[PDB]
Nucleic acid binder design. Structure first.
Ligand SMILES: [Mg+2]
Ligand SMILES: [Mg+2]
Ligand SMILES: [Mg+2]
Ligand SMILES: [Mg+2]
Ligand SMILES: [Mg+2]
Ligand SMILES: [Mg+2]
Ligand SMILES: [Mg+2]
Ligand SMILES: [Mg+2]
Ligand SMILES: [Mg+2]
Ligand SMILES: [Mg+2]
Ligand SMILES: [Mg+2]
Ligand SMILES: [Mg+2]
Ligand SMILES: [Mg+2]
Ligand SMILES: [Mg+2]
Ligand SMILES: [Mg+2]
Ligand SMILES: [Mg+2]
Ligand SMILES: [Mg+2]
Ligand SMILES: [Mg+2]
Ligand SMILES: [Mg+2]
Ligand SMILES: [Mg+2]
Ligand SMILES: [Mg+2]
Ligand SMILES: [Mg+2]
Ligand SMILES: [Mg+2]
Ligand SMILES: [Mg+2]
Ligand SMILES: [Mg+2]
Ligand SMILES: [Mg+2]
Ligand SMILES: [Mg+2]
Ligand SMILES: [Mg+2]
Ligand SMILES: [Mg+2]
Ligand SMILES: [Mg+2]
Ligand SMILES: [Mg+2]
Ligand SMILES: [Mg+2]
Ligand SMILES: [Mg+2]
Lengths: 147, 187, 128, 53
RNA sequence: GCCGUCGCUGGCAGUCGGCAGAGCGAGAAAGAGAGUGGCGCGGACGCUACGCCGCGACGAGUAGGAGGGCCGCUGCGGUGAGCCUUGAAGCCUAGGGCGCGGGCCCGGGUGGAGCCGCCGCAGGUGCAGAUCUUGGUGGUAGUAGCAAAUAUUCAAACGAG
RNA sequence: UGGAAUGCGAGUGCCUAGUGGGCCACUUUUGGUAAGCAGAACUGGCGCUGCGGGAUGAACCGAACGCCGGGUUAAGGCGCC
RNA sequence: AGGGCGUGAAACCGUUAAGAGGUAAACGGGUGGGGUCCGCGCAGUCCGCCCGGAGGAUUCAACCCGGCGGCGCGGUCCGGC
């Protein structure tokens, strides 16, 4: 909608919203990121800190497939498995704990963040956190490793 | 010669909503009558919050509704949320509640109707309580958006915990000069 | 026996002359339609004495006598006979007007229907 | 000349990109062409599966 | 007195009518509230609630910003049982007007074939200038000028000359 | 017994154009013989601003501006223009 | 519409009609005068209720039959959705 833009209201106005003293010249302060060390130093200091210079090692051929390790919390651990499993785990008097396969759901590491309901679990995951292991053993349950 | 500055003579607050939807305008047409004919301030607050934008009525989560109802004193009291009541999946127990909102998500409606509660609209809330007695007006997290993490004091400045506008986080993306005490300075 | 309006107030007008454009007298390329001058050193736009007046909001007519004919009626453009059943009810306040592109054989029917409905036509003898 | 606050950006438009602009208006015609070629292969091999081995 | 802006987030769903009783300008936190013992068929307007109405104050403006345009141009989806050779667009007008204004509608002439109103959509959408681009036409102006190299005259003929 | 007078609804968060050549004036004051010169401090104007007066007039005095009618002044005037 | 011919604007020029003319022309506010046409004006708008005098209908109220519509806390009719 060009009828809703600003160029409709500026017809008749001479400088077209760009000032009468200082004209709308083409590139008054350089192109793009020009002079970030010289005359745009203050803007990059106040708004983009750390932009200049190097830090850390140069990992040459990086692999995001190797870096792939999705995490899931214990607070929403029961969202991976259906709700009737939780119903039957609360209903069973014998103590048949449900097995939550985290790698089947699509996560590798289990972190322990929130409250876990008081019933035993068997969490089959690739990696575990110490706090997650403490929460699972405090509620009741086992942490089965899998490759 | 009159020396009053006309800078702040117009109050820029809303009179009508910017939305062109007709159900919200019908609720506005009903609460304009209730706000001027009832002495209660509840109808004025609900009418005011109907005018606001999407960012000004943030979504309210189901577990945070459960917490504010487990706050004592307000037993057998309905909950009035102007925004949306969304489901929070990281909760197990849920009592029956009397929820009044514009739109409630399908998982949250299934959870409330499985717990055995009641989900009302604003016209049904006006039929039940015209002045709004027996209500608890709630609201979602206003500063909870990611946009407010960039706001405030500027980064690269001492005692300023502000997320800088970075296109992609990493090792070599705004980490070296203004952030390390080794290379230059830090704040 | 012309069609009288319901109420006939005194139609007061604050200004009757046209707001002609600055330097419309000198150049033929400059039309009489008003355009606000937006120069740095112009005489009209900063309200010098004895210059061309500017169309402010203060020149607005009263809301009771706005868009009102000197007869006392308000105009409404009518294309055919079907648009006179719209104005049969609002008769004493508003009047009708036949469009320019309407042919004479339909103008005769419009004038006859408005004479039946007692509606005043601003151009009752438009073609003949 | 950057303003108050915003992301740093590197637009890759410093080359002559307007010569090499691949417009995608061939797309529904190519969907029809793949569909006709696939139906032609399916009519060519009559008892065999249309997918393949 | 009139126009617009701002504020009172002021008032109006109460047009509750023989299914009736016509109000909440009044200095004073709150009900013209339910109970139980001692003839005549009658009553103006309203309210596109994005509308209507009442109070007060305010009104300059460069660069600049924002809002409203039932201001204007072109094309598209709908719509007007729209207009039109019993005269479309364009153009002219010492005519009637309307709107603060952008502009718009009628009357008269020319014209001969298409055009417009409303809700939306889209843009190659509005000129007074840029020693602006193209085309055309004035004052200058019947003016400068038809002045380098000695020179033409008479009679007759053709021929309207 | 909202712990002086008077007055006024306040606080807060984004996005953000234009500007980054100034000039003049009571008072103070640097350099200079001085300047309608150059450079400062407070405040107000011009810039951005029309109007009455100073004959004239970017800055002086009064006074700031929607469109009009009645009245009244400011600064200035009341021989004629 | 007369062979570069549909429509034929503006700048410019010619003719006719009208008005005017020593502070270059032109403009704003306010009037006055003269023309062009317009109000198809020139004994001046109607609309309800009542009174009085003159006229005309196959007519008023109330009953009978048929059809249609509205409502029914029929305190709580029967039957469907
Ligand atoms: Mg401007
Ligand atoms: Mg410029
Ligand atoms: Mg701008
Ligand atoms: Mg300037
Ligand atoms: Mg600039
Ligand atoms: Mg630029
Ligand atoms: Mg340098
Ligand atoms: Mg102002
Ligand atoms: Mg402001
Ligand atoms: Mg100037
Ligand atoms: Mg900028
Ligand atoms: Mg930005
Ligand atoms: Mg394949
Ligand atoms: Mg004022
Ligand atoms: Mg203003
Ligand atoms: Mg003319
Ligand atoms: Mg033809
Ligand atoms: Mg186009
Ligand atoms: Mg031009
Ligand atoms: Mg000659
Ligand atoms: Mg000569
Ligand atoms: Mg400059
Ligand atoms: Mg400087
Ligand atoms: Mg100086
Ligand atoms: Mg100022
Ligand atoms: Mg001034
Ligand atoms: Mg003097
Ligand atoms: Mg003084
Ligand atoms: Mg006066
Ligand atoms: Mg004098
Ligand atoms: Mg022709
Ligand atoms: Mg033709
Ligand atoms: Mg021709």
């Amino acid at each position: 909608p060009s009828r809703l833009r600003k160029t409709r209201k500026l017809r008749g106005h001479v400088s077209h919203g760009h000032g009468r003293i200082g004209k709308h010249r083409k590139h008054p302060g350089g192109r793009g990121n020009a002079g970030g060390m010289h005359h745009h130093r203050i803007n990059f200091d106040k708004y983009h800190p750390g932009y200049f210079g190097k830090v850390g090692m140069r990992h040459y051929h990086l692999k995001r497939n190797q870096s792939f390790c999705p995490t899931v919390n214990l607070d929403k651990l029961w969202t991976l498995v259906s709700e009737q499993t939780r119903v039957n785990a609360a209903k069973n008097k014998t103590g048949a704990a449900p097995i939550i396969d985290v790698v089947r759901s699509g996560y590798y590491k289990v972190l322990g963040k929130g409250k876990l309901p008081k019933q035993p679990v068997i969490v089959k995951a690739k990696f575990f956190s110490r706090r997650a292991e403490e929460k699972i053993k405090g509620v009741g349950g086992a942490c089965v490793l899998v490759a | 010669g009159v020396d009053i500055r006309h800078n702040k003579d117009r109050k820029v607050r809303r009179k009508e909503p910017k939305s062109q939807d007709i159900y919200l305008r019908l609720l506005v047409k009903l609460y304009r009558f209730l706000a001027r004919r009832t002495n209660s301030t509840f109808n004025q607050v609900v009418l005011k919050r109907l005018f606001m934008s999407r960012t000004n009525r943030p979504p309210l989560s189901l577990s945070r509704m459960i917490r504010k109802m487990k706050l004592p004193g307000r037993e057998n009291k309905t909950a009035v949320v102007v925004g949306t009541v969304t489901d929070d999946v990281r909760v197990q127990e849920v009592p029956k509640l009397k929820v009044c909102a514009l739109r409630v998500t399908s998982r949250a409606r299934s959870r409330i109707l499985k717990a055995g509660g009641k989900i009302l609209t604003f016209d049904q809330l006006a039929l039940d309580s015209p002045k709004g007695r027996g209500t608890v007006l709630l609201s979602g997290p206003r500063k909870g958006r990611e946009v407010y993490r960039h706001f405030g004091k500027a980064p690269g400045t001492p005692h300023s915990h502000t997320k800088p506008y970075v296109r992609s986080k990493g090792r070599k993306f705004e980490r070296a000069r203004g952030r390390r005490a080794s290379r230059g300075y830090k704040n | 026996a012309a069609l009288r309006p319901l109420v006939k107030p005194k139609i007061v007008k604050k200004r009757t002359k046209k707001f002609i454009r600055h330097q419309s007298d000198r150049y033929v390329k400059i039309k009489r339609n008003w355009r606000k001058p937006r120069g740095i050193d112009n005489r009209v736009r900063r309200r010098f004495k004895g210059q061309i007046l500017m169309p402010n909001i203060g020149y607005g007519s009263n809301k009771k006598t706005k868009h009102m004919l000197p007869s006392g009626f308000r105009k409404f453009l009518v294309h055919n006979v079907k648009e006179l059943e719209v104005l049969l009810m609002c008769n004493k306040s508003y009047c009708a007007e036949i469009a320019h592109n309407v042919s004479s054989k339909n103008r005769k029917a419009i004038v006859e229907r408005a004479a039946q409905l007692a509606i005043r036509v601003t151009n009752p003898n438009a073609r003949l | 000349a950057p303003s108050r606050n915003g992301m740093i950006l590197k637009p890759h438009f410093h080359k002559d990109w307007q010569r090499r602009v691949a417009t995608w208006f061939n797309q529904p015609a190519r969907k029809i062409r793949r569909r006709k070629a696939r139906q032609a292969r399916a009519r060519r091999i009559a008892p065999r599966p249309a997918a393949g081995p």
